[PDB]
Design a protein around this nucleic acid. Structure first.
Ligand SMILES: [K+]
Ligand SMILES: [K+]
Ligand SMILES: [K+]
Ligand SMILES: [K+]
Ligand SMILES: [K+]
Ligand SMILES: [K+]
Ligand SMILES: [K+]
Ligand SMILES: [K+]
Ligand SMILES: [K+]
Ligand SMILES: [K+]
Ligand SMILES: [K+]
Ligand SMILES: [K+]
Ligand SMILES: [K+]
Ligand SMILES: [K+]
Ligand SMILES: [K+]
Ligand SMILES: [K+]
Ligand SMILES: [K+]
Ligand SMILES: [Mg+2]
Ligand SMILES: [Mg+2]
Ligand SMILES: [Mg+2]
Ligand SMILES: [Mg+2]
Ligand SMILES: [Mg+2]
Ligand SMILES: [Mg+2]
Ligand SMILES: [Mg+2]
Ligand SMILES: [Mg+2]
Ligand SMILES: [Mg+2]
Ligand SMILES: [Mg+2]
Ligand SMILES: [Mg+2]
Ligand SMILES: [Mg+2]
Ligand SMILES: [Mg+2]
Ligand SMILES: [Mg+2]
Ligand SMILES: [Mg+2]
Ligand SMILES: [Mg+2]
Ligand SMILES: [Mg+2]
Ligand SMILES: [Mg+2]
Ligand SMILES: [Mg+2]
Ligand SMILES: [Mg+2]
Ligand SMILES: [Mg+2]
Ligand SMILES: [Mg+2]
Ligand SMILES: [Mg+2]
Ligand SMILES: [Mg+2]
Ligand SMILES: [Mg+2]
Ligand SMILES: [Mg+2]
Ligand SMILES: [Mg+2]
Ligand SMILES: [Mg+2]
Ligand SMILES: [Mg+2]
Ligand SMILES: [Mg+2]
Ligand SMILES: [Mg+2]
Ligand SMILES: [Mg+2]
Ligand SMILES: [Mg+2]
Ligand SMILES: [Mg+2]
Ligand SMILES: [Mg+2]
Ligand SMILES: [Mg+2]
Ligand SMILES: [Mg+2]
Ligand SMILES: [Mg+2]
Ligand SMILES: [Mg+2]
Ligand SMILES: [Mg+2]
Ligand SMILES: [Mg+2]
Ligand SMILES: [Mg+2]
Ligand SMILES: [Mg+2]
Ligand SMILES: [Mg+2]
Ligand SMILES: [Mg+2]
Ligand SMILES: [Mg+2]
Ligand SMILES: [Mg+2]
Ligand SMILES: [Mg+2]
Ligand SMILES: [Mg+2]
Ligand SMILES: [Mg+2]
Ligand SMILES: [Mg+2]
Ligand SMILES: [Mg+2]
Ligand SMILES: [Mg+2]
Ligand SMILES: [Mg+2]
Ligand SMILES: [Mg+2]
Ligand SMILES: [Zn+2]
Lengths: 68, 91, 71, 251, 114
RNA sequence: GUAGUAGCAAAUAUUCAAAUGAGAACUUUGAAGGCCGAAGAGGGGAAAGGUUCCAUGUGAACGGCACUUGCACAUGGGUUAGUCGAUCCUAAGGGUCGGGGGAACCCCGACAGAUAGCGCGUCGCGCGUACUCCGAAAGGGAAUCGGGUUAAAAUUCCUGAACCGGGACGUGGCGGUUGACGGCAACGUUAGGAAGUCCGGAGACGUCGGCGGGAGCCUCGGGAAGAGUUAUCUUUUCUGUUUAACAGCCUGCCCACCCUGGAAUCGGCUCAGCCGGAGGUAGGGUCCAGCGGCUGGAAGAGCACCGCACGUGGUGUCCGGUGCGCUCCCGGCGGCCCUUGAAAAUCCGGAGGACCGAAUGCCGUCCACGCCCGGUCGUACUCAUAACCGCAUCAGGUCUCCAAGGUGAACAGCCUCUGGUCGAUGGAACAAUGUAGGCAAGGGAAGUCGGCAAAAUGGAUCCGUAACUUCGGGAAAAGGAUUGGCUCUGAGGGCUGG
RNA sequence: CCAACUCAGAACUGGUACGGACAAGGGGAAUCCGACUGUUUAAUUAAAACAAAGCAUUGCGAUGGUCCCAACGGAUGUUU
């Protein structure tokens, strides 16, 4: 498992053809965006809840989004 | 203080093996465990690695010497004998 | 509080209960630590620090207080 | 009777030499054109201990005469050798401790070690710690040299035989008393299965000529003839004399 | 207290059967075999370690498993000789070569003497 | 016949109620009282065994009393691997070609000899020292971790997350001053030519002792959750309060190394050493270890607790201290040897630069990402006071890993927690003789071949200690004093603040 | 401000008890033998016997000493 630090980088990996699904984990102090790729599970942490919603609707169509 | 009157390093043998053997081995016991002058670097940092092998801690020079001393008495005589012969031949 | 510590409650030797080497190591580390800080604070010059360092190794000062008074 | 201890050693088995940790045979370079005519320079890389051998050994690196590669060698270390020293082998090598020269180029009275018996055999004589050979004289007509061996015997060898200048390092080893059975145990643990030794007079007749009797005693002269067959040849073999060596005998 | 057992059929405490105790998220202790200590690269003679290279088992140095920068030193004889050893050789090579030139020139002056 | 006789007796121990059954001192459940007491009567494995493993059932026999019982009998079920091993490598050694012996069975064993082949181009050149053999389920060694799951299997099954060795091409990146850039340096950065040949390192190594570091455990305090005790006392006692491989970043131990600088009124420094014009102290750096820190993995898991239903929801999983403590690992230094304490596979690096592109589009690329592939055999169970051997369910024999609290010098003995267990045929009496364990007035070896046996001495602290001696010892010589409980006093430290 | 447990002393106190169980040398004066540690008759002998360091003698310079082998060859010998 690897951690993505930039939202821009997370979007780039979310558009990969091998990205099988994306899962949204909402903790009590941040939201984690996890994208399952061929080799690694990339995770992005977004402390600001409001800033996380904008990224949630910006994901490419056709990618399986799940809420945890 | 003075821990032993005369036994010195051979006190590790206690009362065993007889006084003469302890006296006899004391000479070599002291010599093989002592530091020797290094002709190369100029330090008293030469100690025996194994019988006949003497290495300097500082400069790392390893020298073949006597079993329990860096230089045996015959070793000095041989060097002078060889040196004298070389001068005559190289004259 | 010091209860149950009399001669009738001791089975090992004093060394077995607390080795003399342990006590010596504590004292040297304490005294050498004290000398370094005085040298660092410039209370004592390296000339006096050297005199105290070897005396400590020589079993001259038995604790921190006596070392301070001599200085 | 049964096969005595002396007889069982020849079969090998548990009496073979213990050589697992030995560094290899210590010998001169193979005689070649460079040593026969000129000289070849080598460098001592390390002085090492060889289990079972008192004398230290020296690892020497040489430049191969005609191949692009290094040539590794293992010499019996001479007293005074040191790491980083240059060692010169050949006919024209200078007379200095550590160099290997043919006996023809070594003047009379020199101290040498690891002397060849046959030209090119790479050294058979004076190899133990503190031992050496002394060049006595040369015979240009016969092309031979006289040397004195450590035992005190004089031998004729061809002048082409090579020898290292100096004496073997590690001398004086046997002067130190062992003081303990265990020290003897460690000494022979890395040599061969020859220690401890049980006296024949302590055995039964079945296994030694000296065995048996209601008292421990040999019962017959311990001096046995040269031609005695194996199993009978025990004790002082072909003794020219016996008893304490006093007078010219101990010379 | 919880007591452990070997996780393999190796029942003897050999050097290759070393282990560490790890507490899992399940709240239990368990062994995990630990690889033996490795020396790492060392100088041919002095034996001092070669700086800049990690100490790993030989298979862990495999190119596919280790980045190139971690198994190399950017210098002549990098990873084989220390910096001091390289400096000694360079000076020795230059000075010895210069001395040969002096010897060559010196004998030419004596050669013409006739 | 002996004879229903000898005999059932080591390893502390059983009791009550109920269920089941034709039948219960012996099966099962519950309660109580004991034991093993972490070098175990606990939890595993190597040999060896071979189905003894699990479920159900059971006429007899067998389990030296009994049995409803089972390691017995009958029927059926059960062992899942690219990552654990074998497999590979070599060790002592073993088996061999040729050759030499030998009536022959056989003997020696690379020693009498046109080796095996390998590399690079595309069949040719170069290289080429007579074994491509066997030999380790403890030596060397490519890669897997939590969580869950069975009546019986799992690092093998399920889920999730990684890694290793191969194969193939694509996209992007990188280099062309044809083969990168940065740092005075130690070296740093993710890429960043290259053949035959050559060189080094790792693999790779004894033992003992002292210190230092890491992990796990033990231990102390606070917070919260449940439980125990409660006539009295107890802000109390107990249980727990979790974080895997792997990836990134940070940290930089003890050493080593680099730059500046130039040292006696010598300094620095360890428990001990020891270091310095061959450049110390000091100042500033580099590198190395990690079973160290943070984040991802990852709370979604696990555990505890409280609910609702009879699957589902909620809360918590927090903040510190302590050490000659214990187990394991590592670091560094020192002692010891007439003892110096394996090899090879494999992998990494280096020296050299034949040969090779482009006028900028090709060439090169150990970089990132994507795609494909994963043989065979072993795997159940016991590992022993009942699964191995001893003719047996024999008080014997049989390699090794994990190891809590109290007392104490102490994996001594004694007691306890986790786990295990009451399995040794039972009942009633309390004669002689016996076996094992004790005690005894006064005397004190008179006993006896003989102080055999037993008794006495015993830990620690202080004092004191002869002859003799190889000067090291003798020595714990001998001899004497002290020791509980309770309430106090003194001494011995660390980190911050000019 | 935070600390762990070693040492020393004093008062008081119990039917002089207190290393309270457990644990845990009897001591001394001599003779014989063997120096010592080690080893030995598995299942009647553990010793004064064996070994041992030390001491001494003997053979041998490889075309060799000692020894194995039916023969060929081999062990000591990776030796001097
Ligand atoms: K016979
Ligand atoms: K023997
Ligand atoms: K003997
Ligand atoms: K006799
Ligand atoms: K590097
Ligand atoms: K087994
Ligand atoms: K496999
Ligand atoms: K193996
Ligand atoms: K090994
Ligand atoms: K798993
Ligand atoms: K791992
Ligand atoms: K299995
Ligand atoms: K048994
Ligand atoms: K009776
Ligand atoms: K009597
Ligand atoms: K002993
Ligand atoms: K021979
Ligand atoms: Mg130096
Ligand atoms: Mg202690
Ligand atoms: Mg002391
Ligand atoms: Mg003898
Ligand atoms: Mg006899
Ligand atoms: Mg006879
Ligand atoms: Mg009866
Ligand atoms: Mg009986
Ligand atoms: Mg009875
Ligand atoms: Mg019983
Ligand atoms: Mg019973
Ligand atoms: Mg008991
Ligand atoms: Mg108990
Ligand atoms: Mg243990
Ligand atoms: Mg029965
Ligand atoms: Mg069963
Ligand atoms: Mg059956
Ligand atoms: Mg494996
Ligand atoms: Mg072999
Ligand atoms: Mg055969
Ligand atoms: Mg043949
Ligand atoms: Mg050959
Ligand atoms: Mg092979
Ligand atoms: Mg094999
Ligand atoms: Mg192995
Ligand atoms: Mg199982
Ligand atoms: Mg190496
Ligand atoms: Mg010791
Ligand atoms: Mg520690
Ligand atoms: Mg500095
Ligand atoms: Mg986390
Ligand atoms: Mg949860
Ligand atoms: Mg251990
Ligand atoms: Mg190059
Ligand atoms: Mg199993
Ligand atoms: Mg079981
Ligand atoms: Mg077991
Ligand atoms: Mg049988
Ligand atoms: Mg205690
Ligand atoms: Mg105990
Ligand atoms: Mg009486
Ligand atoms: Mg009485
Ligand atoms: Mg009396
Ligand atoms: Mg009498
Ligand atoms: Mg009488
Ligand atoms: Mg009498
Ligand atoms: Mg008695
Ligand atoms: Mg006495
Ligand atoms: Mg007498
Ligand atoms: Mg004796
Ligand atoms: Mg025996
Ligand atoms: Mg017997
Ligand atoms: Mg007996
Ligand atoms: Mg004598
Ligand atoms: Mg013959
Ligand atoms: Zn030197």
């Amino acid at each position: 498992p690897k951690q993505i630090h930039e939202i821009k980088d997370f979007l780039l990996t979310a558009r990969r053809k091998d990205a099988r699904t994306v899962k949204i984990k909402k903790n009590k102090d941040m939201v984690k965006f996890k994208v399952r790729c061929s080799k690694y599970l990339y995770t992005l942490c977004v402390s600001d809840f409001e800033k996380a919603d904008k990224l949630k609707q910006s994901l490419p169509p056709g990618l399986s989004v799940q809420d945890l | 203080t003075k821990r032993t009157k005369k036994a010195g390093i051979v006190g590790k043998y206690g009362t065993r093996y007889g006084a003469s053997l302890r006296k006899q081995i004391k000479k070599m016991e002291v010599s093989q465990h002592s530091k020797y002058f290094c002709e190369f670097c100029g330090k008293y940092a030469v100690k025996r690695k194994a019988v006949g092998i003497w290495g300097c801690k500082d400069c790392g020079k390893v020298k073949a010497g006597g079993a329990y001393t860096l230089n045996t008495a015959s070793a000095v005589t041989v060097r002078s004998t060889i040196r004298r012969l070389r001068e005559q031949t190289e004259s | 509080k010091g209860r149950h510590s009399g001669y009738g409650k001791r089975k090992g030797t004093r060394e077995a209960r607390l080795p003399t080497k342990v006590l010596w190591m504590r004292r040297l580390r304490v005294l050498r630590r004290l000398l370094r800080k005085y040298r660092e604070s410039k209370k004592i010059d390296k000339h006096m620090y050297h005199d105290m360092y070897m005396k400590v190794k020589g079993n001259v000062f038995k604790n921190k207080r006596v070392l301070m008074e001599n200085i | 009777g049964r096969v005595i201890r002396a007889q069982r050693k020849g079969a090998g088995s548990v009496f073979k030499s213990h050589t697992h940790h030995r560094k290899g045979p210590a010998r001169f370079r193979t005689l070649d054109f460079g040593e026969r005519n000129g000289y070849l320079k080598g460098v001592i890389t390390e002085v090492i201990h060889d289990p079972g051998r008192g004398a230290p050994l020296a690892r020497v690196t040489f430049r191969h005469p005609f191949r692009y590669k290094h040539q590794k060698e293992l010499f019996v270390a001479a007293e005074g050798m040191y790491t980083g020293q240059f060692v010169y082998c050949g006919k024209k090598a200078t007379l200095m401790v550590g160099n290997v020269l043919p006996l023809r180029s070594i003047p009379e009275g020199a101290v040498v070690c690891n002397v060849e018996h046959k030209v090119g055999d790479r050294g058979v004589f004076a190899r133990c710690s503190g031992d050496y050979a002394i060049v006595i004289s040369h015979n240009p007509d016969n092309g031979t040299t006289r040397v004195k061996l450590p035992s005190g015997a004089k031998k004729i060898v061809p002048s082409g035989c090579r020898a290292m200048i100096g004496q073997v390092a590690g001398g004086g080893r046997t002067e130190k008393p062992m003081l303990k059975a265990g020290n003897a145990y460690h000494k022979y643990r890395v040599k061969r299965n020859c220690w401890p030794k049980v006296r024949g007079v302590a055995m039964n007749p079945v296994e030694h000529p000296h065995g048996g009797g209601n008292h421990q005693h040999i019962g017959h002269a311990s001096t046995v003839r040269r031609d005695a067959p194996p199993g009978q040849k025990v004790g002082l073999i072909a003794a020219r004399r016996t008893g304490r060596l006093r007078g010219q005998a101990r010379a | 207290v919880q007591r452990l057992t070997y996780r393999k059929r190796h029942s003897y405490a050999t050097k290759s059967n070393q282990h560490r105790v790890v507490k899992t998220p399940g709240g239990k202790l368990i062994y995990q075999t630990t690889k033996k200590r490795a020396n790492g690269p060392k100088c041919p003679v002095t034996g001092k370690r070669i700086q800049g290279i990690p100490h790993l088992r030989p298979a862990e140095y495999k190119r596919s498993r280790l980045s190139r920068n971690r198994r190399t030193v950017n210098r002549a004889y990098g990873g084989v000789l220390s910096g001091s050893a390289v400096r000694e050789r360079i000076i020795r090579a230059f000075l010895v070569e210069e001395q040969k030139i002096v010897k060559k020139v010196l004998k030419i002056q004596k050669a013409k003497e006739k």
